[PDB]
């Protein structure tokens, strides 16, 4: 059970962008430092980097007191955008080995760490302890390969994906800088996980699929309801211009569709007119709005449009998505293939063009039929096992390489 932060659950901006142009899609999950137009750090010259130690201790203390003040047990702390800052709480880094994994979290979403352990035969004294995560004793593997007896494997686990992770040490040279309009802050950060290839648990839709079109529609609908809720006017009213600015690729006519059932156009002598909430229309509750569209569904959709943009950039037209190698790497194909195989509907290529590492240390998620048929499945498991073990060994290794001069 995953409980996301309130800003994420509410699909607030900027945590959940309403629109992304080509540039943003290319930079998806890699935001570049952009200059500020105003505020302290818009100014030239040196700027102080501030310590956070007193602040970190204080927030931990305040949070624990709030915990004891009601009057123990479990509390949920991620209620406001302010609670999501890197400025307090314990922090880890996670570095993703896939250049563009099929699903990624937005800021404000939650994930668990699970410590998968397989018992040694006979008298097992229990799993080793880890600094992070909750131990899970598993007789069957949640991955493509099987755990060996006595093997502990850490992993990220959420509704988008499961992925093995490997704990490493941050280099002694490195610090985390947090940057706001107001100043820089610095934190020590020692724990950094390498993330291995994802096992997708959520299916990414194809471009212009019914699923995709239903999603943008519903997301637009949610944004609209939230606009009415934000309005302080009675009767509530919103401006077309504000919707168009958030959804610049929607025609005014398609926006009028979403508005015709809940609101009335009020014309004024000025090129700004209002849509006023109908007096017999009951605005959906917070709880009902949340049920309309989940953060996971937004993540699936984002994955599609970003991939679609990268494909266009590489010369692959919409008619391409009998199929080109590059199109096989698309998240709508890889997630579909992996999930089908998880349900026993087919097997996976494993060795193939969709291996995200390009060098045999990752899996190619491409459907092959279940179609000597005990040898067919034993060969699939053997190959899965080999790559599974290879990935764990390479990504957990502390060996120092050796810059490639090419």
């Amino acid at each position: 059970i995953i409980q996301h932060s309130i800003p994420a659950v509410e699909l607030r901006q900027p945590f959940f962008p309403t629109h992304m142009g080509p540039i943003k899609l290319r930079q998806f999950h890699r935001p570049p430092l952009k200059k500020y137009s105003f505020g302290a750090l818009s100014q030239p010259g040196p700027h102080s980097v501030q310590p956070l130690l007193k602040h970190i201790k204080k927030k931990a203390k305040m949070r624990e007191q709030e915990r004891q003040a009601s009057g123990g047990g479990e509390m949920f702390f991620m209620r406001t955008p302010q609670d999501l800052t890197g400025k307090d709480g314990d922090l880890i880094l996670a570095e993703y080995s896939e250049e563009n994994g099929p699903l990624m979290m937005q800021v404000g979403m939650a994930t668990k760490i699970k410590n998968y352990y397989k018992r040694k035969p006979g008298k097992d004294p229990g799993a080793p302890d880890c600094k992070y995560g909750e131990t899970v004793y598993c007789h069957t593997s949640p991955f493509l390969g099987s755990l060996h007896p006595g093997q502990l494997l850490q992993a990220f686990e959420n509704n988008l994906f499961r992925a093995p992770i490997y704990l490493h040490k941050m280099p002694e040279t490195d610090f985390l800088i947090i940057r706001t309009r107001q100043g820089y802050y610095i934190r020590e950060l020692v724990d950094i996980f390498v993330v291995g290839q994802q096992c997708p648990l959520f299916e990414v839709p194809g471009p212009n699929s019914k699923r995709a079109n239903t999603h943008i529609r519903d997301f637009l609908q949610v944004f609209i309801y939230r606009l009415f809720w934000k309005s302080k006017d009675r009767p509530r009213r919103i401006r077309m211009e504000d919707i168009k600015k958030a959804f610049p690729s929607h025609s005014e006519s398609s926006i009028r569709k979403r508005l015709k059932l809940c609101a009335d156009f009020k014309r004024t002598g000025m090129d700004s007119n209002w849509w006023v909430l109908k007096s017999d229309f009951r605005l959906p509750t917070e709880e009902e709005i949340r049920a309309m569209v989940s953060p996971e569904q937004c993540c699936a959709y984002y994955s599609m449009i970003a991939a679609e943009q990268r494909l266009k950039d590489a010369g692959y037209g919409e008619k391409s998505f009998k199929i080109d190698d590059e199109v096989r790497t698309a998240p709508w194909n890889t997630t579909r293939a992996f999930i089908a195989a998880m349900k026993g509907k087919c097997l996976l290529e494993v060795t193939g063009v969709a291996d995200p590492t390009g060098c045999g240390e990752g899996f190619s998620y491409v459907k092959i039929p279940n179609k000597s048929v005990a040898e067919h499945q034993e060969r699939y498991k053997e190959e899965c096992q080999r790559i599974f073990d290879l990935q764990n060994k390479v990504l957990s290794s502390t060996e120092v390489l050796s810059t490639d001069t090419d």
Binding site: I1, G71, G72, G73, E74, F76
Partner: protein, 912 residues
């Protein structure tokens, strides 16, 4: 305010019917310049009121004790006075029940017994105290008793020792927690113990002569107490747990099955009386009410549903956890659906709110007569709506605020501490000590959930629905199967309501799927091209994909038999459905539904709604050996209700006498069915209603009756060969309902009873089973079922004709002689079932005399309510409610709340 009393009650003198001595009341007046104080006392001899070592003016109206004011502005905020009252108890206390040696009868003449019931304003029969739920007090207790008794109060026990030599002991009991005077009690009873170790000391009291029978409730207490600690995550602070079988403990505000005096559960007997669901319910509702209720003493009596909804809910988890083989999950909806019967009632009769907030502007009290003001209006919120609709709403709010979260909620609430701390280092501790309901609201609100003010408002005020209209379509061209569900509520103050209303359509071979939602008033919902189910190939449809995709494409491409849309799974919304053509829907829910909450309701609808032949098909669910006792029962009761229709009446019947011998092997039985447990006979709920399917059919059409009589004659040949066996009570008791409505049709040529002429063959033999064995003594069975419902076999075979004055002439005698608490109530329930028929005025006079003084107080309630239920008039209205002396008795039964029974005064309240 009275904060603390130390009460010193010497003697405890049985040879006066009386307890005497001194309460020392510390009072901190929470106001300037108090001159006089109002304590409460009822019927209590006062010797002397002493303030600061002078006698002080006390005038009894409610005592007004006049404070001497011997300092300036005296008595100001938080000054502290010791009021010293010397009191003496009267013999006929309302609070108490005092039996001296000499009126105990032949079998003791030695050992007195006096026992009191505190809650709710009966403390004023013990001592002058301020008797109020607002004034919160902790007490010390010193009292001396006969040393061959052992006594119980409220407040942790800190030592029994002698009263230095000779014949009276002094117990020292000491409460730490602030609780109202409601809580206080004293019970001075027998001394014979039976203690187990291992836990916080559980120990078992009864009469000395009845100690062998206290093993199976010791060890039940072992399991019930120990288990609950883990799942509630709450230790029980009190270091011991004493369960005592008072011979005078029949209450229904005290025990009942548990009275909650401090670490001394007061129980009725019910020692080995065959529990398996019945008192496993009773003692898991009991050991719930030691947490929420006592552990965490709320400061507001207007969310008493926090007590009783949380109590009902933790009964159901523990039941289905520890006993998982009678499968509680498929029984929860009986409780669920009975509250629906009472919430389908608007317009004079007969519904109430649950959240009962006393507001100033409460303009609608026509239907709310019960406030929540004094005393008996608290007692009466254990009526079924107040329990299992609180249960219902707590089960809902779980699903919205999830279960792990409400776990962290109630586990903090039990161990969240309310301290008192002053600057000279005086550390006080209250939990086991006051807690508030305002911060309960807030705590759950913080953890989980959205708007709970609206949702809970439409459980208490003017909300809920009656009827859901169903209409159907299915269009061939599109393959779109279209549903039109309206909803409708006849009452003042009607709205549109949410109620998750699921539908699951079943293809040619009942191999489909669904979902749906419907939660607006008039909705038309569109169900996509599901010719092939979502479970297309589980093994669902390789059933129509057996060979009925193409061979019977003659009768699938004729979609005139459309996809069969079963309605309301699992009583998914608690409404009355209006859905034409429903026979297939009931069958499909009988066979293929996985939750049996649906099934038992799909065969209540098979029973009633006109259905074509399912009879051979629902014999599947007659002997599906995974199913409840009660679904196998109400599968028989389908064939019972439907009862022939036409003149194939006697074609049902062979299937009935099939399980009239339920593999009955009566060539070893009934001598090795004493030795067996009967194998429950596959639930004797189901065996009862196979000869009672026969009997209903016998009742409904009067060209049955010879062949049924033949059938049920063989059941009578099986009987009179059994001994006592625990489980087999349920067999005997619902076979006496079997044998009733056999002679009942058998002489249904009515015109009086007259004498039934000369049907010796029946009347003799049937009375032979009806009456008790007159040799057999009745001082040996501690239970009585058979002869409770064998006076009912006596009546109803002498009610369908009518032998008037034979019936009460047993039950008067049987409620005089005293022996057997059950037997007495059995008799008194049949003395009012006979007045329900009798309508000579004299019998009702003698019935409200026996209401008045009989003089068990609680059997007094029982009779009073039962006469208040069954009215003395019919349709006609000749002199309606036009009395003068009953109205005096009425006002004199009002304000007997002031004495005790808080289910008597709403007896009056209903007949006002």
């Amino acid at each position: 305010k009275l904060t603390h009393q130390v009460v010193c009650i010497n003697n405890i003198n049985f040879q006066r019917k009386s307890v005497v001595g001194f309460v020392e009341l510390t009072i901190f007046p929470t106001v300037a310049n108090l001159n006089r104080i109002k304590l409460n006392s009822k019927q209590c001899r006062i010797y002397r009121v002493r303030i600061n070592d002078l006698e002080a003016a006390f005038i009894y109206n409610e005592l007004c004790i006049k404070v001497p004011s011997e300092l300036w502005k005296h008595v100001d905020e938080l000054k502290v006075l010791k009021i010293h009252i010397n009191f003496s108890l009267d013999q006929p206390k309302g609070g108490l029940h005092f039996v001296v040696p000499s009126v105990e009868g032949s079998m003791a003449e030695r050992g007195a017994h006096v026992f009191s019931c505190g809650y709710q304003n009966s403390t004023r029969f013990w001592f002058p105290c301020v008797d109020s739920y607002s004034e919160l007090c902790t007490w010390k207790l010193e009292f001396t008793v006969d040393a061959a008794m052992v006594a119980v109060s409220n407040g942790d026990l800190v030592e029994t020792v002698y009263t230095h030599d000779m014949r009276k002991k002094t117990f020292h009991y000491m409460l730490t927690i602030p609780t109202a005077a409601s809580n206080i009690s004293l019970a001075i009873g027998p001394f014979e113990i039976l203690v187990d170790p291992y836990m916080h000391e559980v120990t078992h009291f009864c009469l000395p002569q009845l100690l062998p029978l206290l093993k199976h409730t010791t060890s039940y207490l072992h399991e019930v107490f120990e288990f609950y600690e883990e799942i509630l995550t709450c230790r029980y602070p009190y270091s011991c747990f004493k369960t005592v079988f008072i011979d005078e403990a029949y209450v229904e505000v005290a025990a009942y099955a548990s009275m909650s005096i401090f670490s001394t559960n007061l129980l009725h007997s019910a020692m080995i009386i065959d529990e398996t669901p019945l008192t496993r319910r009773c003692l898991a509702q009991s050991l719930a009410q030691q947490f929420f209720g006592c552990f965490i003493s709320r400061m507001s009596w207007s969310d008493e549903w926090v007590l009783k909804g949380i109590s009902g809910y933790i009964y159901g988890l523990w039941m289905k956890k520890t006993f998982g083989v009678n499968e509680y999950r498929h029984w929860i909806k009986e409780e669920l659906d009975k509250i629906v019967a009472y919430e389908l009632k608007t317009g004079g009769v007969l519904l109430h709110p649950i959240f009962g907030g006393g507001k100033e502007k409460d303009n609608p009290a026509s239907h709310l007569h019960f406030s929540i003001k004094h005393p008996h209006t608290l007692s009466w919120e254990y009526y079924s709506m107040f329990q299992c609709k609180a249960h219902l709403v707590m089960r809902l709010i779980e699903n919205r605020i999830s279960m792990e979260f409400m776990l962290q909620v109630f586990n903090k609430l039990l161990s969240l501490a309310s301290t008192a701390s002053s600057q000279k280092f005086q550390s006080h501790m209250w939990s086991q000590m006051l807690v508030s309901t305002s911060g309960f609201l807030k705590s759950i609100s913080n953890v989980s959930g959205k708007d709970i003010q609206p949702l809970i408002k439409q459980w208490v005020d003017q909300s809920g629905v009656v009827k859901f209209y169903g209409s159907f379509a299915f269009n061939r061209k599109r393959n779109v199967l279209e549903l039109e569900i309206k909803q409708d509520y006849t009452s003042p103050g009607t709205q549109k309501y949410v109620g998750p209303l699921k539908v699951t359509v079943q293809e040619l071979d009942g191999s489909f799927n669904h979902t749906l939602q419907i939660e607006e008033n008039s909705l038309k919902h569109d169900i996509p091209c599901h010719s092939k189910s979502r479970r297309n190939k589980k093994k669902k449809i390789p059933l129509m994909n057996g060979e009925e995709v193409d061979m019977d494409l003659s009768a699938m491409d004729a979609d005139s038999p459309l996809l069969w849309i079963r309605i309301d799974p699992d009583m998914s919304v608690l409404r009355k459905v209006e859905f034409e053509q429903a026979d297939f829907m009931w069958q499909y829910q009988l066979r293929y539904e996985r939750d049996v909450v649906a099934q038992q309701e799909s065969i209540l609808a098979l029973e009633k709604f006109p259905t074509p032949a399912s009879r051979l098909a629902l014999t599947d669910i007659l002997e599906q050996e995974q199913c409840f006792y009660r679904v196998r029962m109400s599968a028989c009761f389908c064939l019972a209700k439907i009862a022939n229709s036409m003149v194939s009446t006697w074609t049902g019947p062979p299937a009935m006498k099939s399980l009239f011998t339920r593999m009955f092997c009566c060539k070893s039985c009934p001598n090795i069915v004493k030795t067996n447990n009967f194998m429950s006979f596959q639930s004797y709920f189901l065996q009862k209603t196979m000869p009672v399917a026969m009997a209903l059919l016998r009742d409904v059409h009067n060209l049955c009756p010879k062949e049924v009589l033949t059938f049920i004659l063989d059941l009578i040949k099986y009987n009179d060969n059994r001994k006592n066996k625990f489980s087999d009570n349920y067999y005997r008791a619902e076979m006496i309902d079997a044998l009733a409505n056999s002679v009942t049709p058998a002489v249904s040529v009515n015109n009086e009873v007259r004498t039934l002429d000369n049907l010796n063959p029946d009347v003799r033999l049937i009375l032979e089973e009806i009456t008790r064995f007159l040799n057999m003594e009745k001082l040996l069975p501690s239970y009585r079922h058979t002869i409770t419902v064998s006076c009912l076999r006596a009546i109803r075979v002498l009610q369908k004709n009518g032998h008037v004055p034979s019936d009460p002439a047993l039950f008067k005698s049987y409620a005089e002689y005293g022996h057997f608490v059950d037997i007495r109530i059995a008799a008194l329930e049949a003395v009012v079932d006979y007045t329900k028929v009798d309508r000579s005025y004299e019998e009702l006079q003698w019935l409200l005399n026996m209401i008045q003084n009989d003089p068990v107080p609680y059997v007094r309630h029982k009779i009073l309510n039962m006469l208040t239920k069954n009215p003395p008039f019919t349709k006609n209205m000749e002199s309606p409610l036009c009395n003068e002396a009953l109205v005096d008795q009425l006002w004199k039964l009002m304000n007997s709340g002031t004495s005790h029974d808080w289910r008597l005064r709403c007896g009056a309240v209903d007949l006002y």
